Amino acid sequence: TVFHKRYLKKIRDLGEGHFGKVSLYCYDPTNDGTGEMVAVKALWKQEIDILRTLYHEHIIKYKGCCELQLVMEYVPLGSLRDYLPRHSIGLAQLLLFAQQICEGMAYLHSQHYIHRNLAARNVLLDNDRLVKIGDFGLAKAVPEGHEYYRVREDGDSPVFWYAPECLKEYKFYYASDVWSFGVTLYELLTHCDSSQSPPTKFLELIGIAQGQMTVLRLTELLERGERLPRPDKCPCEVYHLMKNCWETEASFRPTFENLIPILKTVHEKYRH
Numbered sequence: 023t024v025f026h027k028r029y030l031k032k033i034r035d036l037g038e039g040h041f042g043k044v045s046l047y048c049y050d051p052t053n054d055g056t057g058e059m060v061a062v063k064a065l066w067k068q069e070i071d072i073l074r075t076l077y078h079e080h081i082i083k084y085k086g087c088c089e090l091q092l093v094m095e096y097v098p099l100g101s102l103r104d105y106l107p108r109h110s111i112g113l114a115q116l117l118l119f120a121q122q123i124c125e126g127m128a129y130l131h132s133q134h135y136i137h138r139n140l141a142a143r144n145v146l147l148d149n150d151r152l153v154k155i156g157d158f159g160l161a162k163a164v165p166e167g168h169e170y171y172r173v174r175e176d177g178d179s180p181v182f183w184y185a186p187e188c189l190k191e192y193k194f195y196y197a198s199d200v201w202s203f204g205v206t207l208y209e210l211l212t213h214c215d216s217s218q219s220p221p222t223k224f225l226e227l228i229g230i231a232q233g234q235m236t237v238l239r240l241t242e243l244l245e246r247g248e249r250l251p252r253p254d255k256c257p258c259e260v261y262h263l264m265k266n267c268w269e270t271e272a273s274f275r276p277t278f279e280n281l282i283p284i285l286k287t288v289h290e291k292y293r294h
């Protein structure tokens with residue numbers, strides 16, 4: 023679908039992820055005064071071409087583009103990062119969010135893509151609190167006959183959601199996305215509390231200032247087996263699952279395909 027900027031009118035700002043800004047716009051090509059609300063991402067053909075080939079209930083829906091800006095579905099409940107501090111959410115619902123992330127991620131990996139920006143702020147919720155994986159700004163196609171994508175520097179990347187191989191070897195495997203999921207799972211269990219966030223907690227792990235974490239210091243701590251702590255009221259078994267996703271060796275981490283039945287089982291145990 024080719025959208026026309028003439029009938030696209032901006033309503034209000036949502037934010038920015040990979041330096042590209044997202045805003046709520048109204049598309050009214052018939053001038054009925056109500057129109058339909060869409061999300062417009064601006065300032066790149068690969069991110070658009072990746073999202074174009076993706077169709078899944080747990081992946082933000084591509085709607086089209088306009089002369090270039092990305093047009094996606096607008097989701098009213100927003101990101102998990104802002105949603106969790108706002109509401110009283112139970113353990114089962116948090117595990118259901120994690121299960122839905124895994125389903126969306128398993129599908130992404132099936133289409134031969136890696137996300138590389140899997141964090142709670144990049145996961146959105148529709149009206150039925152259903153997961154919608156967003157911000158494909160860092161997403162890449164894993165080359166055919168290759169097990170990883172060679173990263174061109176950690177530059178503007180969420181390093182505190184990254185496995186040691188991404189920082190040390192500049193390698194991004196499907197298993198590197200599992201490590202980020204482990205960190206996202208840690209985020210859900212802290213109810214996305216800012217005082218417990220991964221950049222904040224990792225600095226606290228040694229006792230260094232807001233910007234004293236080097237790629238070497240971070241690599242050595244992760245290789246030494248130092249990990250994020252168990253979030254308050256988090257069941258030991260949900261924490262042990264995060265640790266499995268945080269295995270030093272990439273090949274030893276669970277896959278998303280195998281994490282789904284496990285998160286389904288754990289969700290049932292804590293329900294009601």
Ligand SMILES: O=C1C=C(NC(=O)c2c(Cl)cccc2Cl)CC=N1
Nearest residue numbers: 036037038039044061096097144156
């Ligand atoms: O309602 C929405 C919101 C979207 N994007 C984000 O909210 C978003 C921002 Cl503004 C910054 C960083 C990451 C993300 Cl996912 C996409 C589609 N519909």
